[PDB]
Amino acid sequence: MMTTIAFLGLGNMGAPMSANLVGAGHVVRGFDPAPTAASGAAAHGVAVFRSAPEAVAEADVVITMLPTGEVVRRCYTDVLAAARPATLFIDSSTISVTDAREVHALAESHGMLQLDAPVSGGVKGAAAATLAFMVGGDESTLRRARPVLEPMAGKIIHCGAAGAGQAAKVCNNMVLAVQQIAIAEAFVLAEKLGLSAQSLFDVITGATGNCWAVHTNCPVPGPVPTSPANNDFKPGFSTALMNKDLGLAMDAVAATGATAPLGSHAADIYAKFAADHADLDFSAVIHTLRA
Amino acid sequence: TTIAFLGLGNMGAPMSANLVGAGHVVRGFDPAPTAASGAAAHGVAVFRSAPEAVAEADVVITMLPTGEVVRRCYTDVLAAARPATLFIDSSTISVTDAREVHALAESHGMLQLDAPVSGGVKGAAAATLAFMVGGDESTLRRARPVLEPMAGKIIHCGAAGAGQAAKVCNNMVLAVQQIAIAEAFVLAEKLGLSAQSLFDVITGATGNCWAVHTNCPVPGPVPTSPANNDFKPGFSTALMNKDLGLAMDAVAATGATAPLGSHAADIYAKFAADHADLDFSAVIHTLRAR
Ligand SMILES: NC(=O)c1ccc[n+]([C@@H]2O[C@H](COP(=O)([O-])OP(=O)(O)OC[C@H]3O[C@@H](n4cnc5c(N)ncnc54)[C@H](O)[C@@H]3O)[C@@H](O)[C@H]2O)c1
Numbered sequence A: 001m002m003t004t005i006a007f008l009g010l011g012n013m014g015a016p017m018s019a020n021l022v023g024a025g026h027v028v029r030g031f032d033p034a035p036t037a038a039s040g041a042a043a044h045g046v047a048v049f050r051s052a053p054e055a056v057a058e059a060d061v062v063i064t065m066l067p068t069g070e071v072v073r074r075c076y077t078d079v080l081a082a083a084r085p086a087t088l089f090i091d092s093s094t095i096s097v098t099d100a101r102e103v104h105a106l107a108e109s110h111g112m113l114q115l116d117a118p119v120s121g122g123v124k125g126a127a128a129a130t131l132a133f134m135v136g137g138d139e140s141t142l143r144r145a146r147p148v149l150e151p152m153a154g155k156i157i158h159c160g161a162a163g164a165g166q167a168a169k170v171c172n173n174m175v176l177a178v179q180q181i182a183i184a185e186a187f188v189l190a191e192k193l194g195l196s197a198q199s200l201f202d203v204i205t206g207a208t209g210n211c212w213a214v215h216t217n218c219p220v221p222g223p224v225p226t227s228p229a230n231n232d233f234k235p236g237f238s239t240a241l242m243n244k245d246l247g248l249a250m251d252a253v254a255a256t257g258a259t260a261p262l263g264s265h266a267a268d269i270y271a272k273f274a275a276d277h278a279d280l281d282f283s284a285v286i287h288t289l290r291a
Numbered sequence B: 001t002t003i004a005f006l007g008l009g010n011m012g013a014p015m016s017a018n019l020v021g022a023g024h025v026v027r028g029f030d031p032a033p034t035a036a037s038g039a040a041a042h043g044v045a046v047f048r049s050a051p052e053a054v055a056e057a058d059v060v061i062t063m064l065p066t067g068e069v070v071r072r073c074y075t076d077v078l079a080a081a082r083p084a085t086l087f088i089d090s091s092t093i094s095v096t097d098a099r100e101v102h103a104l105a106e107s108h109g110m111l112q113l114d115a116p117v118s119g120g121v122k123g124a125a126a127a128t129l130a131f132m133v134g135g136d137e138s139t140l141r142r143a144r145p146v147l148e149p150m151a152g153k154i155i156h157c158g159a160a161g162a163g164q165a166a167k168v169c170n171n172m173v174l175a176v177q178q179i180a181i182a183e184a185f186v187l188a189e190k191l192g193l194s195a196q197s198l199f200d201v202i203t204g205a206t207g208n209c210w211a212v213h214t215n216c217p218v219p220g221p222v223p224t225s226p227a228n229n230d231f232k233p234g235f236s237t238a239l240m241n242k243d244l245g246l247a248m249d250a251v252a253a254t255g256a257t258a259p260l261g262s263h264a265a266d267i268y269a270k271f272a273a274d275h276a277d278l279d280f281s282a283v284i285h286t287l288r289a290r
């Protein structure tokens, strides 16, 4: 065994992430207050503990993979004094840039190294060890973190100072939401103009409007058989998750005083769509555009 | 092949020169003397009226500003044309006007394509224009030898109107992507994320598109992008505003819902009132107006 890693949050992402660490030869000290999550992690080789302070107590690294910034803040407030001095904390939760910098500052005030390393790839990315880690913090701290991150990761990219990981991801996902609606709008307009879906696909994908939202995640069935449109809009990337990321994008915009017209319009659209269609893929927003 | 070329402006001139360069007999007409003179300089036999230029032609190409002008041109010249003369409209006009002129042309025993272009004056001179073609496939096959000399890319979009539909749908997406990318870069700046960091991430992730990887609206990440060169077009706000207007005509006509597309249209219409002469990526610096 190489490093002793505490993992806090063994959910849909945390469990397959923790399993890959166990496979790579690490001792993984898990905690999750949902007992079903803890059991599933235990089955794949994680040492499950009674409380989060117990898990972090004998750990060289501490990964958190949690729902929100409020949960990360409270987790940190609980566990930081329990951890040994100069333990490496890695938050791979998707939280706000304001929260990330608060919890980063908190971790350093307790004498701990701290990175924000939010991920893209979903549960499939998590299990196959192909997640993109977008890291913020010190360059030396990331260098120390790499042997832990590499067995979970397809790509590791340093974004800047603390919170830059969260900033990088939330800017990209804001763009992605806008693209996904914009592509849906185009396909529906083509439909009404008598332009075939296959033809619009071939044009856009060979021209300047090409992007992942069309080439991989095509919102009409046919042109890309692997896309969610061909499987009843089963995620994939859920509307619930995109709505959450767009909430954090709107938080970032509100915090900075920025102006993002189309990003905010996309946030308003997905917020309404999430109310009734949270369980569908975010490409399904196309359904709002048909009378 | 003898070719009538009607509209010898910024696009029509270099296109016609390329056809002369490929061994075609190009007959021309433009109501601007400077346009006609400069066309005559590179081998086009200019004529005093459009019906005159059309008379001895196997093919008739229009590169004109609007649908009203293409419609009027067609009615001025269709009687002067021989039967089975191939008409190609490379003007960018609405899908409604495109299908109207197609029907009108084929009623006179002509073969007609809509075939608008992407690539600008740069692509027109270099002969790398992307023709997106609506019409019959056998009519496109006949058109290929004429199109090849002006084109780097030729794509059959469908029946009459599909060419105009395909272009306007893609450029609507482009306008939205260009603004979305510009929002991402100023949000990143205010969050203390460098331009180069944001560029590296987005270009290797789901958000990647031409609007960032080639037309990056901040200077540095892509040295050749207009942002590094006082926002010299490139692809102007004036022309993007022109293409979005046509998208809104299409949305109005079909009764389509296109909120982001329509929002991009409003932004660029307002932006074109101040900065029509700048590249459409310059929209980044008019965001604080909203
Ligand atoms: N699933 C995806 O598609 C996806 C993709 C990218 C990013 N993310 C992000 O990853 C994060 C987690 O995602 P998930 O799908 O695993 O969420 P999840 O709800 O499945 O898992 C979160 C887990 O954290 C546990 N938890 C709560 N408080 C805790 C504490 N104090 N200590 C230890 N554990 C605690 C919960 O019981 C739960 O099991 C989220 O922030 C999400 O935005 C998810």
Ligand SMILES: NC(=O)c1ccc[n+]([C@@H]2O[C@H](COP(=O)([O-])OP(=O)(O)OC[C@H]3O[C@@H](n4cnc5c(N)ncnc54)[C@H](O)[C@@H]3O)[C@@H](O)[C@H]2O)c1
Residues within 6 Å of the ligand: B006, B007, B008, B009, B010, B011, B012, B029, B030, B031, B032, B035, B050, B063, B064, B065, B066, B069, B073, B090, B091, B092, B093, B117, B118, B119, B120, B121, B239, B242
């Ligand atoms: N310039 C570009 O970057 C570009 C790129 C792609 C497509 N387009 C499209 O191509 C079309 C024309 O582009 P342009 O840049 O050459 O415009 P332009 O204004 O430079 O040229 C149009 C020419 O047509 C002439 N004209 C007007 N009425 C006429 C008639 N009845 N018969 C013959 N000629 C007539 C005008 O005098 C003018 O010289 C437009 O619809 C535009 O949207 C332009």
Ligand SMILES: C[C@@H](CCC(=O)O)C(=O)O
Residues within 6 Å of the ligand: B148, B149, B150, B151, B152, B153, B154
């Ligand atoms: C558009 C056509 C011709 C290209 C060219 O002439 O360079 C082709 O690519 O097949």
